[PDB]
Symmetry: D2
Subunit: 183 residues, 4 copies
């Protein structure tokens, strides 16, 4: 008995609210386990590298992040090196907080599963750390730079009701079927 | 005798360039007449109230504006009065320039045929003057306020390579299939 | 007060289910009244001529139809005549059934708010009868031809889990930003 | 130096035409080289596994196909095995013809870069041979089964003016942001 899930699209107010914290008594519980399993499953089906609970319609501070080596390798080596893209294992964070460690800004195109079909360049900090709980309830601080830091920031912004269209260079917004190419 | 026309979508660089003037050699000529006729035809087919030549792929300073009574009438009356939405006849402007007459800002939702399917709230000046040539080279000046002034501003921005997403309140950006309703 | 509503998009399984009937006990009731008020409000905000409860996420046999004169005059006279498009007052039907009175097929482009942004040609019967209850349980039978018969058939198909892409000439499917025009 | 390329979307009549053959005089030439390099670049940028000239607005019988290992490994092993998905190198075909080698039908979801953002299940033959010329005019033949045969048939359809929506199971058409998941 399979089921349907959908990623909410811009216009749904759940993407602009401030997600609520998960309560201690829910940690390690069945309901949070179903939510984390669904987030990871959607994230992986869509081949995206992060997803947050509000995008599945659940206004709670939960997000998952993963970048498999196959996806880094899909990126041409020069572009991979420019973006400082390196793989990293799946991590799920509950009630996370972000601390900026290197505030230099780096700008590259990104897109969001909740604004399907578009990209724009967005400046992001070079390095950050995210601290929060696992769904079992243990604390972890994960520090990263480059593309991983960009993913952490994009996903953290979703828990504050922020989407990348709020931070983009709007003259670079584009449907994914238009692209710049080498002559 | 039928052909296809298309409204360019965001990503096409024609929408971000600064449109070149129409050379005087072209005024009153067949090529300019085919372009103005096509802009008016597509504007009326799409039931929209302004269109510019870069949106049909032509990087030239030409735009058309029209608000038929039936479109105003489709607006509920209290919204129509708040927006100061009143009908006006077709005008076509070639090499137009804009001056602000009343710089008070008014915010309402707008959409654009070149960012199909979305709306966002955009501040606009209350009143403006657009001056330019009709397709035959005669001077035309139109001072407008309220919703007519907002239409003029949106079309004139297209000839500078500016889309409403560059000026919007991005937290109000929405797919048109999401909307606020009265309970 | 203010709330959000959305029209479900294709992929949502609610659009492919067969809506359940409203039980006799519910006719004239406050829950049905909430649904019918919401359906008509969304229909009027989107300026669409018909809407069904599955498109608001509610798998119940309830639809609304309305074609105001202004909306109707937005179509040029020659096209309204070809399409037999005439205004008609609001009807809300509960548990409707359809009978075909004239099975001649008529084909014109149609779109659906649950497949936002596309049109395609769809053959429809020239005249039908819809019979059902008004939200109060009164029996209402409406015989319609031409464009109103097409709206009726499109909304009734929603209650059976059928969308217009199931019945279209697929070689005429188009984004709305492409159109055939007269030279 | 850089320019912009776009994948034409449904509605553009170039996608429904039957593409003209490449004339013998053009084989090996610079214009055909520019077209093939552009196809391969867009195909690689978009991480898709085939692309045809009509989709870059050029109504000529040219297509390219490529499934790199990394892109292949984005798909989980169980799903790869089910779909008979394996990597294969770049091939570019000019004036190709298709012969069916195993007419057994296999049904899975596919999407098209010219119908951005949707998928639907389409039955396809289990094995085919494509034969045609390379850009230098040498005979190229490739016998393929499973997922590779699907991609061949999808690209060949584009040179006949056929899109997947003409062959799909329409009840399975879905926005990519709706998906079936495991409980
Ligand atoms: C990069 C920062 C955003 C990471 C997370 C998003 C997915 C998402 O919206 N999470 O909320 C994603 O994977 N986006 C991808 C993305 O932005 N990419 C994928 C490769 C490169 C970059 C576009 O430049 C695709 C799915 C649009
Ligand atoms: C109002 C300022 C924009 C006027 C021009 C646009 C058409 C366009 O993009 N021209 O470039 C339009 O008619 N847009 C309409 C529009 O913005 N409307 C219709 C009335 C209300 C407002 C949406 O709030 C619809 C078609 C999206
Ligand atoms: C004609 C049969 C479909 C009518 C009802 C639909 C809206 C809807 O999906 N109902 O479920 C509608 O108004 N569609 C309009 C529609 O198809 N129109 C407007 C009149 C002309 C035709 C576009 O050719 C627009 C919103 C797409
Ligand atoms: C499989 C048959 C179509 C192959 C070629 C297309 C791209 C295209 O339109 N070529 O004309 C594609 O790669 N489509 C992908 C595709 O259909 N996929 C990618 C992974 C599996 C399958 C989705 O079920 C995405 C990009 C939609
Ligand atoms: Co996102
Ligand atoms: Co516009
Ligand atoms: Co519909
Ligand atoms: Co395709």
């Amino acid at each position: 008995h399979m089921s349907f899930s959908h990623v909410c699209q811009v216009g749904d107010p759940v993407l602009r609210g401030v997600a609520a914290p998960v309560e201690r008594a829910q940690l390690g519980g069945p309901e949070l386990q179903r939510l984390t399993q669904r987030l990871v499953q959607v994230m992986r089906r869509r081949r995206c590298v992060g997803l947050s609970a509000p995008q599945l319609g659940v206004p709670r501070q939960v997000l998952a992040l993963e970048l498999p080596e196959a996806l880094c390798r899909e990126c041409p080596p020069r572009q991979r090196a420019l973006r400082q893209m390196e793989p990293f294992p799946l991590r799920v964070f509950v009630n996370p907080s972000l601390r900026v460690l290197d505030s230099r800004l780096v700008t590259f195109p990104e897109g969001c599963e909740s604004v399907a079909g578009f990209l724009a360049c967005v400046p992001r900090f070079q390095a950050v750390q995210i601290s929060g709980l696992d769904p079992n309830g243990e604390q972890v601080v994960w520090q990263a730079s480059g593309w991983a830091a960009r993913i952490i920031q994009h996903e953290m912004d979703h828990l504050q009701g922020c989407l990348f269209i709020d931070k983009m260079d709007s003259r670079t917004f584009t449907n994914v079927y238009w692209m710049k190419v080498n002559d």
